[PDB]
RNA sequence: AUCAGACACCAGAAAAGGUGUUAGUUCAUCUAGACAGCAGGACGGUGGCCAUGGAAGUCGGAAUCCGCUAAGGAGUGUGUAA
RNA sequence: GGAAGUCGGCAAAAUGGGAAUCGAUUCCCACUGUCCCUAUCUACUAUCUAGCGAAACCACAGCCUGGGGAACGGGCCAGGCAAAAUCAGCGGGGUGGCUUGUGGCAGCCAAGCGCGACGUUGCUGGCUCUUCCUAUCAUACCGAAGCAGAAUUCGGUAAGCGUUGGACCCACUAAUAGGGAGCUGGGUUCCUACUGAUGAAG
RNA sequence: AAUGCCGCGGAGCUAUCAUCUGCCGGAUAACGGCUGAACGCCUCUAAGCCAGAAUCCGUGCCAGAAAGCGACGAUU
RNA sequence: AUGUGGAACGGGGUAUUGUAAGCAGCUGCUGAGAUUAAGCCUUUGUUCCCAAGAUUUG
């Protein structure tokens, strides 16, 4: 059983949005 | 003036934490950017308003619970003067009220700007700008809140005085037997110690005599304690109970006590003082005796002799200044009063009860005490109805005779 | 969005489904816990709701607002003729539950209990239990073997008893047969008690004793299909859930009234059963003109407080309370003062015709 | 006020069952049991 | 009860029998209690606990440091200051006093805004008197007329905090 | 003069009635009230744990003296039989068919003279004189009709309202042939009868009665000896 | 003010306690195995729990102290209770 | 504390026949004539249920017609008579022919001195002061 | 891990907290006896001076010196009206 | 009991009426199932039966949870599940892992890497409805506080159970806590679900 | 006489407009402790243990798998 | 499916209403008359009817 309050599995928009904005973070720190 | 009913004042940090925690817990928490701008504005407006309401609610509670020094009996007002510096207390209370108005002004200002919030963020910071200003306002009265809490704690300790009632103020030299007289007269447990000025503050104790209750107020011996003692007798319809050490066993000279009493006579005027000769068992006094109002009653403090007589004399002085043959049964003339400890005392139904299960379980037998030719039938059931008639309508001690008379009559009719 | 004005739920979720009971006879879904410290005793009885009346009793309730006053209470009268024990069932405890290992029947079975096995007694050739009677007469050693099996392996002993419905003034001829668990004693003791009680009648005088607290269980009156108004007390896109009140069956559900007090266990052969120490006035529990829609009570009867589920002439099961509960209401004695037996078929005004005749004039008839 | 699920209420209810308040039920059962 | 009645009770009857040993045990196990609190609690209470433990930790590090060396609708959406007025400037968003902080003096004075010269974001807002970030506003300096630049955003912060041009 | 509370109520006259030959206490509450009465009158007069019409206001429902007792119409037969069995033979009991059921409120009666509600029925007055064997007089107390509730009677003393005038004080004393004092009971409550029950040799008042009031009742009732 | 009443049954394996701050209740404990409770006459109102298992004796002590607990009263003034005074061995 | 204030005994459940907005007769000699019911003490949280009172219940009352100084106080009132029939616990059904009540303080002693008309014994038992100052108790 | 992890630059919360564990880096004393533990000493000028009802190191204002040493701080806290 | 209902005497009963202000409004009296609070009675329909006998609509159909980048859907993914044939009801179904409790300017430090953290100092919409969440108003149990007692404040576990009646106001109440997922007023000029009822069958 | 109008009106239905009924076993959370290390002291915790909330799980109560089952009776 | 069998009426009890028509002389017959199970109780009362037709079942 999950035994959690928040699901450990992520949606495809959410997982795609990390690589969208993680790269921009490296752009900003550059 | 029971000053115990004042709610306890939190320090500035707990006050802010309680207010902010209440705002978080009692108001809605979740909002999304996609919501209508009216709902966003209303959302943050509620938090600012709710936080304003919690702060004033607490601050008003302080401002109302504290006693208004001007509206109270000048005995207590001057007592609060010597202890708390009315000006400092008044400044502290005014600072909170000025804070309260400031908390209201900031909230009204930020609610007004929130009506024009265009994005979820610009409302978010007005709320953050709001609550921070509300908090920074409160943080500035750290001294005032701390001061009021200390005042609160000592206020709850003060005795509940009532100058309206009959009183008898007891003042004199420190540890000069006044504490012993107060302890012997009133039920108050006044501590007696070799240390001088053991009674730091006043001690009020009630005493019942002459079908009335008198509130004897013992004052500090004679500083702040001396000032409080003076103000205690300053405004009080009572009589002085000065106790002078006759044998000087209290450590104070008799002449010094007489001189102090003469100096304090200006405030002790319009009262019937007492020239108590304390420590009797253990010249200058002529001038004091020349006043006449002082009652020269010997007080054998070591032997505890004369305390009751002195108290009775003081109470009397204060009061002055302010055919049907009842056939009682013979058993009544020799009835032993029901006192529990004695063995000869009979039992009561209360004791039968605690033995037989106590309140709610014991069934009292109502029938158990019937005057009756037998104790056995004492639980019988008397027939009430029979064949449409009550048995009661027919209960007659000679009813057998009416039945026999009748027999003869029916025997006549059949014949 | 939240509900603005809230109220408690209009129904009870613990009593649904509101479907018709699959039985007419009250089922015992729980028998009182057994104990070997106490030897044998029964735990249930089967009666018929004749009718209900009201009584006056002196209330000896310590601490009450009406301590030692005369109180009026409604009472239900259930006729309880003695029931004949005709069988014993052994139950073995298994990791899957209580399982009926075997059953032993008495040799002579009355037509009362034989009618239970048929939907039409007249067309049948009455062949039931005939070969069982033959083998009982031939060899009793076989029957001794099943009883040995019951007392050796089984952990719960129950007796099959049927009510003598013939004695009651009921138009039904089938007897109601049920199992009463023999609580108390060892399994051998229960088996013996069943053996010496075969074919003999056990009466309510031996089951209950006029003061204890019992659970009365039965099927309620049928009100037919009803809308949400009287079935349930009713004043986002989704699908309708089970919690939403709906229209359907109202009535004829299996119910259990707890904590019923017997005010009196009267004997049918006695003619003083409706008379008390404060009343005299020889009378019977049957009201003047007979019970409405039931008849005349001529056998042993039980008078319970309050009301019991189901209409008149329906079968009720009376079981001993599962759990001891020593509320002083459950522990106090009862001393009846007066019982009402006026005509319930209308506004009755007289208790018995005898005492009505003195008040009324000489009727021409 | 505490409900019936209260562990305290269960405890002194058990205390009542532990004493003579249930002994009136034992001899009550024994009477019919013997007769 | 009069004045310090509880220590009169303490003096006359003593304190509770187990108080000293119970408080010793509680103080001893407080070390484990703090760590248990830090590892169990979640949410705001954890977060305030985290921030207050950081504050106290930095504080105790500083005093042990101090111990050391001593031993050694056409409407305007921005706040404005007071045909051509085609848009609506709410009197609510309008402001009249600003907190101008002197650079050299380092003193913040709340003074009225005499006027606004130009808004760097939009010169059109200068006519309407809209105060934005970096806007130039002139205020009276008699109590200290001088110009200043807005150091914050009046729309968001609400209070017009500006830095004097001196 | 003693202080007692029925349950936690200051009105003991309502829940009890006391005479010179018997005592009546309410039933079904706490017998601590019965316990207190027995502690002072158990060895002198019988104490009856009685109710009147299934009710506990027996003090204000029944009026009596050392000779006889009266009960209202609402008195049940069982309770009347209970009272007769409890009380001794030389005491007589009477039902009253009075419209004014509150006998304890309409009749204030001592062993020799009784003063009654002005609008009492003639038949009630005649049977009162027959049973109580006292002279009956129709008059109001301080302009107030409830004589039994607003006035307490004993053989040697009595109390009335503090609202009565001095001339009313003198007239009432002259018509009663007993010393009478204007006073109050239970700390300012002008229901003297409801707050006080007195026989010829002892007095009971509520626990909230002041010390001054107790001294007044003791002074008028001469109970120090 | 209220003396505490102590009763010992089944040679000290069950302790009944009465009148703790004027209680009408009967607080009953059953001692853990290996523990016997006695009342010593050397000092008044002295309870002694003797046994072999330290855990059983000391857990019995904790049970007594916690069951005789003051509720809703100010403990800075209300000092009534039962407390462990000395811990040691029989010899 | 007003709710069961100085009751000196519990009341049995009685049929409610005087809800709020009721207009009902004053029974004391204090001078008031008519009373208007504003609220009843001891009513919980029942949705849409109109607050109601029975004999011996204490209500909030306004003197519609009466002496002016008797007015301008929402004064506690004790309902002493009720027209709706109710079951006395002994079994008999009772109903007085008019709805009557008395003006009383929150503590439980009225401003009046004598009650005109019959008094329910339930009222007289929860309120010993009314019983003390009642003329006929039925 | 009494709401573990399988996540995917662990990038939003993110700054950090933990008497949880395993590894390291830099400084410390240690058979001239290490840390801890129990036994004891922890002083005398001196109750240093203003400050006070009462303050003796410990309500409170600058230090805070000395005879002895192996060490006893005008004193780390509790506590005492003192 | 007598408009307490509703935005409101809509509709009935009093037979509709008495006085005021500008037909309308208000007031007092009067009446009444609008309401507390629904219950009962009658006729018709609905139900079944004999006869007759349509139409709209129709890719195919028919359970829910999480995901399927979106539009989440019924078809796809992973699960819960899943047993013929039916009857009568009622109508449900035709866009940040956001966000929350702590404001803006300047200076002083300074763990450390010109910044520099915490600190520190300077100033001005309402009527009824099923369920869920806890972020708890009350009830249960605890800790702390000048908490003597009573009453009370704050905080913890806790959503089991309650959280009203009237025109922000005034009462009751232990309390009148906050939110998520059939209807009307003033304001701008088939099938499936749910609920009951049968029902072939080892 | 389309229930002409009125009074009473059994039976049935019904009314917090009437009456009755609504119960006990474990496991825990906050929290209070026992023994006891880690760390030669200490420690409610690490291994274990005790007490402990209207909480959770059962008992009780309702339904009875129409594809879960047992015993008994007869068997053309 | 021949039985303490059932049904239709009848009597009695119990209830509802209120004292009938008629005979008469408001009064008496006359607390009478009418109704009473259609979801009231009872029946040595009379009469009547049933030991039958079909269907499915190893």
Radius of gyration of chain H, Cα only, in angstroms? 14 Å
Our count of helices of chain C gives 8
Strand order of the largest sheet of chain C: 1-2-12-11-8-13
What is the element string of chain H, with H for helices and E for strands?
EEEEEEEEEEHHE
Query: Care to count the β-strands of chain H?
Result: 11
Using the alpha-carbon principal axes, give the shape of chain C: globular
PDB class: ribosome
Keywords: 60S Ribosome, nucleophosmin, ribosome biogenesis, fkbp, ribosome
Entry title: Fkbp39 associated nascent 60S ribosome State 4
Chain A: GTPase grn1
Account of the 3D structure:
The structure is cut from a larger assembly and holds eight protein chains of eight kinds. Chain D contains two helices and no strands. Chain D has helices at residues 7-18, 23-34. The radius of gyration of chain E is 29 Å and the shape is elongated. Chain G is globular and about 40 Å long. The structure holds four RNA strands. Chain D: It is found in: Nucleus, Nucleolus. Chain D: This is UPF0642 protein C32H8.05. Chain D: Its main location: nucleus. Chain D: Residues 25-35 have a biased composition (Low complexity).
What descriptive keywords fit this protein?
part of a larger assembly; 8 chains; E: 166 residues; alpha+beta; 5-stranded mixed barrel; 5 helices; 5 strands; 17% strand; G: 91 residues; 3-stranded antiparallel sheet; two-stranded antiparallel ribbon; 1 helix; globular; RNA-binding; UPF0642 protein C32H8.05 (chain D)
Question: Summary?
Answer:
Chain C: InterPro entries: L3_arc_euk, Ribosomal_L3_dom_3_arc_sf, Ribosomal_uL3, Ribosomal_uL3_CS, Transl_B-barrel_sf. This is part of a larger assembly, with 8 protein chains of 8 kinds. Chain E has 166 residues and is of the alpha+beta class.
SSE layout and pairing:
This is part of a larger assembly, with 8 protein chains of 8 kinds.
Chain D: H1 7-18, H2 23-34
Chain F: E1 2-4, H1 12-15, E2 16-18, E3 23-25, H2 32-41, E4 47-49, H3 58-61, E5 68-71, H4 77-86, E6 92-95, H5 103-106, E7 107-109, E8 113-116, H6 122-132, E9 135-138, H7 147-150, E10 152-153, E11 158-160, H8 166-176, E12 180-182, H9 192-195, E13 196-198, E14 203-206, H10 211-221
Parallel strand pairs in F: 1-14, 3-4, 5-6, 8-9, 11-12
Antiparallel strand pairs in F: 2-3, 7-8, 10-11, 13-14
Chain H: E1 18-19, E2 23-26, E3 34-40, E4 52-53, E5 58-63, E6 75-81, E7 86-87, E8 93-94, E9 100-103, E10 118-119, H1 121-126, H2 128-132, E11 136-137
Parallel strand pairs in H: 2-9, 10-11
Antiparallel strand pairs in H: 1-4, 2-3, 3-5, 5-6, 6-9, 7-8
The structure holds 4 RNA strands.
Subcellular location (chain G): Cytoplasm; Nucleus
Family (chain G): Belongs to the universal ribosomal protein uL6 family.
Protein name (chain G): Large ribosomal subunit protein uL6A
